[PDB]
């Protein structure tokens, strides 16, 4: 089942920015570690970035370190992904998730992430 709404995505020229918002109407997202995952058409589900419940701790993978910015608004129960300076390697299907396995945020965004979003296509082409 899908319990997070997804707004964003589309086509972008390499070197440009893009924002991925994600909210939860009936889910209390302000309590759990929220993260972003992607998957290229070929393979395979890899993680992108997660953020602690209080926004103090954030983890990013190598391909996005310094170029992507994850953020959250617990007053609005939303989670965002700012994808600046996009590369053609970022072409995937991006989905927001929320881990209910761990009380804290783990390095490499380890967890179950059972509450996920619908997911949108991101395409970085020239």
């Amino acid at each position: 089942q899908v319990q997070l709404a997804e707004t964003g995505g589309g086509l972008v020229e390499p070197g440009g920015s893009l924002r991925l918002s994600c909210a939860a109407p009936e889910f209390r997202l302000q309590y759990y570690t929220a993260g972003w995952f992607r998957q290229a058409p070929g393979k395979e589900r890899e993680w992108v970035a997660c953020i602690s419940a209080g926004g103090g701790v954030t983890y990013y993978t190598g391909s996005v370190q310094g170029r992507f910015t994850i953020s959250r608004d617990n007053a609005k129960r939303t989670v965002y992904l700012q994808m600046d300076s996009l590369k053609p390697e970022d072409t995937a299907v991006y989905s927001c998730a929320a881990d209910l396995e761990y009380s804290q945020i783990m390095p490499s965004c380890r967890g179950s992430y059972g509450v996920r979003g619908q997911g949108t296509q991101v395409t970085v082409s020239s």
Binding site: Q1, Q3, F27, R28, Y31, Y32, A53, D99, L100, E101, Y102, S103, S112, G114, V115
Partner: protein, 259 residues
């Protein structure tokens, strides 16, 4: 004034619940009496009254907080307190009634129900079977808010019974079975509201007979088979303890081991 174990549903996670059920199991048994690698709850016969019950404080996202009382002898819920009111299940013998006197002394006034706590009672009052009452973190949050408001007259009697069925299954039956714990553990994971499978239903009904079947067995083998059910409504028989070692976490004291 007994041991207090606290758990919240606001931001409840699989680990906070795993640590909760494990903390409940820790205060239920001494841990010493273990038969066929399955622990045994203390004996009610010669048990001091200050070692008879443990308390479980439950709160949720809403400000409402409710505290349950559990019988150490069988991990089952015997009553609960909400604010300045305490409500107890109708005991089944003269002795159980006196033991209830020692639970919530500092209350405005205490009430005792007309009905016991077994499922055939709570299903009739709630008007819902266990097979249709859904379980999960969401249901547990609603069960807490319903239990508190019964002291203020907010909750109808069927809902009060429905809330008891959720609390007993997700705590008592979870403290008794790693199976039922893991089944609640997966509902908390993906955040879902499911009703218990025939596997969970049968394990709850057979827990009393499974404690008897294991303690007085011959080197693990049962005198008579116990019938269980899979996730689908498929019936199979269990003749030995080895399969139930990952399933059962606690057993009620039937007899003492041989010297």
């Amino acid at each position: 004034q007994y041991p207090i174990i606290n758990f919240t549903t606001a931001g409840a996670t699989v680990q906070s619940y795993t640590n909760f059920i494990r903390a409940v199991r820790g205060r239920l048994t001494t841990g010493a009496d273990v038969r066929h690698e399955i622990p045994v709850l203390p004996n009610r016969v010669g048990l001091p009254i200050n070692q008879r019950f443990i308390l479980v404080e439950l709160s949720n996202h809403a400000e409402l907080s409710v505290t349950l009382a559990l019988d150490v002898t069988n991990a089952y819920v015997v009553g609960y307190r909400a604010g300045n009111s305490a409500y107890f299940f109708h005991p089944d013998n003269q002795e159980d009634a006196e033991a209830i006197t020692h639970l919530f002394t500092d209350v405005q006034n205490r009430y005792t129900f007309a009905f016991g706590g077994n499922y055939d009672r709570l299903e009739q009052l709630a008007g819902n079977l266990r097979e249709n009452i859904e379980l999960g973190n969401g249901p547990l949050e609603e069960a807490i808010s319903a239990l508190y408001y019964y002291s203020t007259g907010g909750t109808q009697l069927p809902t009060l019974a429905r809330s008891f069925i959720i609390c007993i299954q997700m705590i008592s039956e979870a403290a008794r079975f790693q199976y039922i714990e893991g089944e609640m553990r997966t509902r908390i994971r993906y955040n879902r509201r499911s009703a218990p499978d025939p596997s969970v239903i049968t394990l709850e009904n057979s827990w009393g007979r499974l404690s008897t079947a294991i303690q007085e067995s011959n080197q693990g083998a049962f005198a008579s088979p116990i019938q269980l059910q899979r996730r689908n409504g498929s019936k199979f028989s269990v003749y030995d303890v080895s399969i139930l070692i990952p399933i059962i976490a606690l057993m009620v004291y039937r007899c003492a081991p041989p010297p």
